[PDB]
Amino acid sequence: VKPGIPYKQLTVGVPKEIFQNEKRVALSPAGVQALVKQGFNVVVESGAGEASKFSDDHYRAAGAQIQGAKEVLASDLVVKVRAPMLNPTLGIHEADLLKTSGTLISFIYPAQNPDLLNKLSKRNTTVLAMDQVPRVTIAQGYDALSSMANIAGYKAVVLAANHFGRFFTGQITAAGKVPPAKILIVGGGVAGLASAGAAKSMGAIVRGFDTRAAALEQFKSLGAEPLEVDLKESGEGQGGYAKEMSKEFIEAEMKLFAQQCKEVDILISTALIPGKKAPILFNKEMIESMKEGSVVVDLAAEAGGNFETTKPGELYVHKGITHIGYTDLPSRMATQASTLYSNNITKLLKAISPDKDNFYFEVKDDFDFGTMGHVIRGTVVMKDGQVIFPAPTPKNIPQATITPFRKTMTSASVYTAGLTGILGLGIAAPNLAFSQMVTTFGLAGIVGYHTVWGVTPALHSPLMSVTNAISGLTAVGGLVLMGGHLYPSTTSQGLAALATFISSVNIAGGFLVTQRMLDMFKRPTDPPEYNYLYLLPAGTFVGGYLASLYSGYNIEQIMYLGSGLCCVGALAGLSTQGTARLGNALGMIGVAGGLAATLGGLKPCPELLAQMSGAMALGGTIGLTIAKRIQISDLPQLVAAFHSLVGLAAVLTCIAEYIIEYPHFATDAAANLTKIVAYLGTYIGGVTFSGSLVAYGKLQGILKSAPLLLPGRHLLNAGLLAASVGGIIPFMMDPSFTTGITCLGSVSALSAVMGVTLTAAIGGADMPVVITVLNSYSGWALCAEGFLLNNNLLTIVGALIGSSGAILSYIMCVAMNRSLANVILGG
Amino acid sequence: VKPGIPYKQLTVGVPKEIFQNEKRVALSPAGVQALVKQGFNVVVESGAGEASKFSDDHYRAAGAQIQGAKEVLASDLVVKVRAPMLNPTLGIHEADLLKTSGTLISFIYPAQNPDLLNKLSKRNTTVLAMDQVPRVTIAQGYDALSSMANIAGYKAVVLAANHFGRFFTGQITAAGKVPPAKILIVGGGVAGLASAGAAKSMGAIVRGFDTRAAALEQFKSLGAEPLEVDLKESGEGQGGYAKEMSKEFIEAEMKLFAQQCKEVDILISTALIPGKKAPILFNKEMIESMKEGSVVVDLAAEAGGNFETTKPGELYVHKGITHIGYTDLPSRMATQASTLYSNNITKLLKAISPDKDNFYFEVKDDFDFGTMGHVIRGTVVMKDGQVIFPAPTPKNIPQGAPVKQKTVAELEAEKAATITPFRKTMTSASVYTAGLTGILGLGIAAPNLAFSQMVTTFGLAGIVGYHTVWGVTPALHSPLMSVTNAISGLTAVGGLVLMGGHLYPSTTSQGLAALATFISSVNIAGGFLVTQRMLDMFKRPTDPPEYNYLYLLPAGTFVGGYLASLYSGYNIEQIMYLGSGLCCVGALAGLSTQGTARLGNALGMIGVAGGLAATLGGLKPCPELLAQMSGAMALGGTIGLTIAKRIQISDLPQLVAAFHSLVGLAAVLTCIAEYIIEYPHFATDAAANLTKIVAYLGTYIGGVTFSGSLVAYGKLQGILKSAPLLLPGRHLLNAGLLAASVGGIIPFMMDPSFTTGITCLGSVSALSAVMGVTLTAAIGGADMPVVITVLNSYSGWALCAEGFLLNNNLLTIVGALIGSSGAILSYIMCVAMNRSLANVILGGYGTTSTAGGKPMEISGTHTEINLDNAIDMIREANSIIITPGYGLCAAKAQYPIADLVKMLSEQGKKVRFGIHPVAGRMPGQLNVLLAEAGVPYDIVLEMDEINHDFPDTDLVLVIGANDTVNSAAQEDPNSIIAGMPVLEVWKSKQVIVMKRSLGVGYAAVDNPIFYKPNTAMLLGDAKKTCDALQAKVRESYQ
């Protein structure tokens, strides 16, 4: 036997209210269907919902039974709204018609009704209180006082108009301004904020006030203008309630209200402190200072009132302003209130006995906070005649490190170190050509910095290919170092032939995979453009050049400027999704013009010309035929596959220079730079080679996605870099061919090891950043090749590619929320 | 003598209303201040305002004169609400108590009341019916039936609740959810739309319905659910009024309403057909099908009804449904009814006699549909005792098809359809092949390698400068120009190279290039002082203290690091030129983020010092010639410092236009100075034809930059006149000057004689100065800032000229940095207005978005208030956006404005500034004036950053601006400034414009923002009005 009594033997009782002009009923038909869902039997008195606009047909259909009056209160559960009284119709008190040990669910206010408690102790019954329910978090779904405060506030707002003779909203008609009404609200609780919301939505403006700090914040939340009192007091008593305030605070607040009273139109006071009367906040000399036609509502007329002038129940128009001072506000919205009050009981009755049919609710003396035993102890006022109204105490709980002088110091430090670096580059100059080349270098660097900045996340990899294609222009270093006859006779010419063979593949394949990374945007609704019109510069620029070689005009430098500006136009126009085709075409024209210019920059032997033509032709054919037969899903896969050659070509070119310039060294002015910069070029190209190989291998499923950690993870890179830097001292001005060539071999092999070590432990989710990083490195190899060869095109193009690739790597780090240091070095 | 009886001996009378349960009164105390400002005398019956809460003290203090009843009715004008009825308190008709041949103002309803018109014809009176006013476009302010319908439609909603049982709004309460209430409307007139507004703002569900097509659209603009029926008969009859329907349409409509009547809770029927009774649209068994507790409100209870169950003056609960069938809804809100009806009678009496004082008011017979004569003929029912109530037909009738509504930005989208993508691609591909032909042409003209290197560094400097100028803050364009006038002082480098001799100059060439150094050393010190005085006005007083003297640390590192590199025997001058060039690029690049501005000034100082020191060390003179150079530069810097610290900031553009002219002189005094000093080399040189052509072109460029700048000075200071001097043929003369200038290179070549070349130099200098004076004075005093900035480009290019001429590498990078800056500023200012550069320079008509003829005309009247409305309306507002113009700083009125804003943001308001790009006499001028007055830079917004906050804005103070707030830029396709991006100030709650009088500044004969009904004028001088606002804010807040 479970501890309780099943729901079939119990019955609830809904009487009508004999109290004066009471219109609401205890249960709606929405609440009669519940508890029949749960299991009770519902007995409803006949004339019960008629003032509440609930006909008896909904009660007969909802599961109840319309019956008399002497037996509705004689039920196991009596659910009223107001506490029982002396019935004048039957001549008997309503407690005398209750049964023995019944259950009553009502408003009680037991501290204000001693004799009702005595008469219910005579009937030896169990009484719960709807008004003693503690306001905790879990019990806010069943709070009768909050619901009645909400409806009373809405009723006061909707009742203020229909007596106020002007608008609340106000509009600029084309007939004159009408200004809005200005409403003041005293006391932000449940009624006041609901009033503020109903008034703010209707069109007026609100300037509410309360002594607490949270209610003012909620006025700011609802859109009100909270008032601030000068005297900085508190507003809290034993929790989040209101205490009786000091007289200095009262006379400051009344001065504030006397200031505000001359300008508002509707004053809705809702001040009420617990356990005492309502605070008087308005004098008769204070309230008569309003305009004629103002409407002034008090909602605390039950326990006194907020005014010196309130007849509780009348609408006497005291000196041209109306007092709305009813004490029964929810009774005028009985169809509304009897819903929410019914919802306040159903959610009570589902919670106190949360099972099939037992109806038990253990009333225990120990309770802490927030637990339902807290609610059960607070709610039950009488248990079997014996009164437990003083509830006990709650248990356990009732709830610039940078100092910005140093910013200016480090900024001035950066600029003064930069100006010293410019001076140090100036001191070590061999001739005028180096100074001129550093000038066009620095300008190309700034041009390359500013020229991306506007790309779209759809367009990271569709431009990288073009940079690949523009970094395919290492082939000029092969073109300025072949010679002899049709076959390459010397080993320097052989290395140059290898370089310009392997670097034609990059050009042809990079532009074709650009063309294939632009076809994957063309939806089948787009207007047919005309790309062949973009051939109109090219024959003008390449072929129109050739007559100048037929007319004896030696045009190479202005051609280099033209190809550099076309490459800038490529990178620029390929950055905003509308002009990507234009950028692709300008990159093609830039490469073609540069290679034709450097081709005419030798006037070679006809067999030598046939050699260079055959080498570039075979390289371009291979670069086409790889890039064409492949999928689409391997296009960003492919770029590193055509990037790995690129720096390798630079390495060969650097080595080629050291082989061609070694007999010229003994009687040389510019002798150190054409070894130091060649050494750095070898380093950069070798790292580019091995790193792009590891990039492709990690993207082609040869290796994993996991960064392969090592024991030596930065000692190892430190040792590689230390040997790499100390590889420049074994040719301190040495006359040996042998130690120079083995230094070149040493830095090449160690650069390969370094690229493997860096690009290995990365992870295939930052590898499209790493492609931009190596594509950024190769531009500096191109600038080194320019310094070796004294060629403006390679200097401009290399600086452009370098700064653009590095800035795109930074923007790709900006797209996600990572840095670059925590990405690369294994943070 | 003028035809009329003046207002002084013309009195009015306001009686108390005598009709049963009438609480309205015809004139408010707010309504008797007009008609007293207009000129009448006002007599009010002693108890007329007591019903609508108007105390008699407000009358007698408003300008009224309290009397009894028999003498208020025998007045020269009687103004009341209803028709004058039989007085019960003494049995006599109120037409008997009228003055003989007087005039009456009320509702009449003459067709329903000819018997009262008999009594009016016996007394030979003139009658103005309020109800018979035809509803035309110039008659919105005086439409009494619309106002009464508006109040009735609101009052029906607010009276339906307090009788309905539950919420309208509905929310998710923790006790449980409640659904919103359903409200049906029948017939969207004016009352139905007001009820729809009142129901939608309270959070309800509105599903109104009407026969006419546009009323359903206005429902769904108000947010209702506009219903429909499955039968298609056109509801409209003769006009905007409806008509009777077919019987079967009535059957289908009552079927639709019987289908939805079982669902809604509130229903308001405003169906009212003119000429006969209101249609019955609901049966009594149809309406008992609703829920128990619904509220049914009928607004047609007087003229029949929309229900067969409506008691015409009472509530009753018929089987659980309340029937609010009140016949006088506006008589319950007598205060608001009296105020609106008073406004209607006020605007009627103001509109009928627009004469100052005659009150003539003639009735005419032939009129156009819509004119005032139409309203006068349709309104006067009895004219001098005889009946003229059947109105004649409106001749010259419009409305064959009245639909244009062609907004401005629609036209350029239509023009975008002409731009077929073949032609887009083709016009893109022509520009690049033109550029590559330009590259090949510049290639062919190369004499050697060094010129090609100079072309390459010129092109890269141009791109660097182009990208770094778009990076600047839009709030710093005016320091920007000043620092360019600093950096353009590097023609001193052009001066010192050709400068030789001893303590004194020896030849004439050495004397020209000492004058060049002298007039260039003004620009350096002057530009850096005026940039320094401008950048520390942007420093807020709460900023961290700025330790700028640390930036002397790089300079002595660089420049002094040069000297020990010169003392030890090196040649770093080509690297010093690069270092100074990068410092000059950084001078604008750091001038981009408002916190590094003084950084970007000190870098300019370091670069100019390094460049001058580098050129000097490369010269290695005797200490006599070094002493001459030091004397020249110190004297020039003395004068440049001592004129930069004397002026005000608002006299800055003159100084800016003064700094260009000196550079335009200096290039001329450096080009000639090389043509003389390079003369014994021309026969034995290959580049000799190069350094002549450049030595031509620079003389042209400075030759235009000089003279025109003096005119651009001379108009802006006021020495020359503000009116553009137009010549009869000035297009032929300017083109002929340009033809002579381009033809002057033909004798300059092919003919190596000394005298014939120097006279070509003098010829091109003279004709270029004439070209500048001719083009400059024909511009106009408004568009003159364009001549400020475009010349700033030319002063750049002159620098580029001598960078090709002296084979120097700093001058090209600096000049390409400056000329790009001038070009981009001129482009921005020719975008901010929709004009083109040829339209500005050559003086065409209007903007580029100008269509053909007939711009639109104004409609409506202008509202003007005083300081007291102004201060109380400032006090109530909680978001103020201020748009100043040039007229603010023309009258020195920014000093009270900054104090006003500092006062109003202590109170807790949100006050900001919105600055149009061309407000002022210089790009970015008004930012500096507002920073001088003391506004922190964080509340000064541009046009693009603030133009979508005008709907969320209480009050906008337009100060001294007309064309930057003109609305016709976005509405009239024929206005003179259509398409110009403006401020959308009319999209807010209330607008104040402060100017002297209702006139124009430069164009736009009338601004249509002055007449929209939430625009208040505050005419007066801005100086006294703004500091009076300062004084009132101080006296009232303290």
Ligand SMILES: NC(=O)c1ccc[n+]([C@@H]2O[C@H](COP(=O)([O-])OP(=O)(O)OC[C@H]3O[C@@H](n4cnc5c(N)ncnc54)[C@H](OP(=O)(O)O)[C@@H]3O)[C@@H](O)[C@H]2O)c1
């Ligand atoms: N800023 C530039 O760089 C630049 C460049 C090229 C062209 N523009 C021209 O500049 C124009 C600027 O137009 P905007 O809207 O700023 O001005 P606006 O349209 O020319 O009108 C200025 C207004 O200020 C009023 N005003 C003048 N002095 C006043 C004072 N002491 N107190 C009060 N009000 C005073 C004038 O009223 P009253 O005259 O009736 O007294 C006038 O209505 C543009 O339309 C453009 O055509 C500017």
Ligand SMILES: NC(=O)c1ccc[n+]([C@@H]2O[C@H](COP(=O)([O-])OP(=O)(O)OC[C@H]3O[C@@H](n4cnc5c(N)ncnc54)[C@H](O)[C@@H]3O)[C@@H](O)[C@H]2O)c1
């Ligand atoms: N879930 C929960 O437990 C829960 C939820 C919401 C609110 N609450 C509590 O319930 C209360 C909500 O307010 P209510 O309307 O129910 O109570 P209430 O009827 O006591 O409200 C009276 C209002 O008048 C204010 N007031 C009191 N003395 C004043 C004075 N001298 N001057 C000006 N204003 C004065 C009070 O601050 C309050 O805003 C708050 O105390 C809040 O902490 C609890």
Ligand SMILES: NC(=O)c1ccc[n+]([C@@H]2O[C@H](COP(=O)([O-])OP(=O)(O)OC[C@H]3O[C@@H](n4cnc5c(N)ncnc54)[C@H](O)[C@@H]3O)[C@@H](O)[C@H]2O)c1
């Ligand atoms: N630009 C203009 O010309 C303009 C602008 C605004 C207003 N106006 C005038 O003001 C008038 C505003 O209307 P009002 O409120 O003064 O007149 P009203 O109160 O008589 O309107 C009656 C309403 O009931 C509707 N109705 C008529 N017969 C019906 C039927 N059988 N069933 C259902 N609905 C029916 C009408 O369409 C109208 O919406 C317009 O009709 C027009 O003449 C004109």
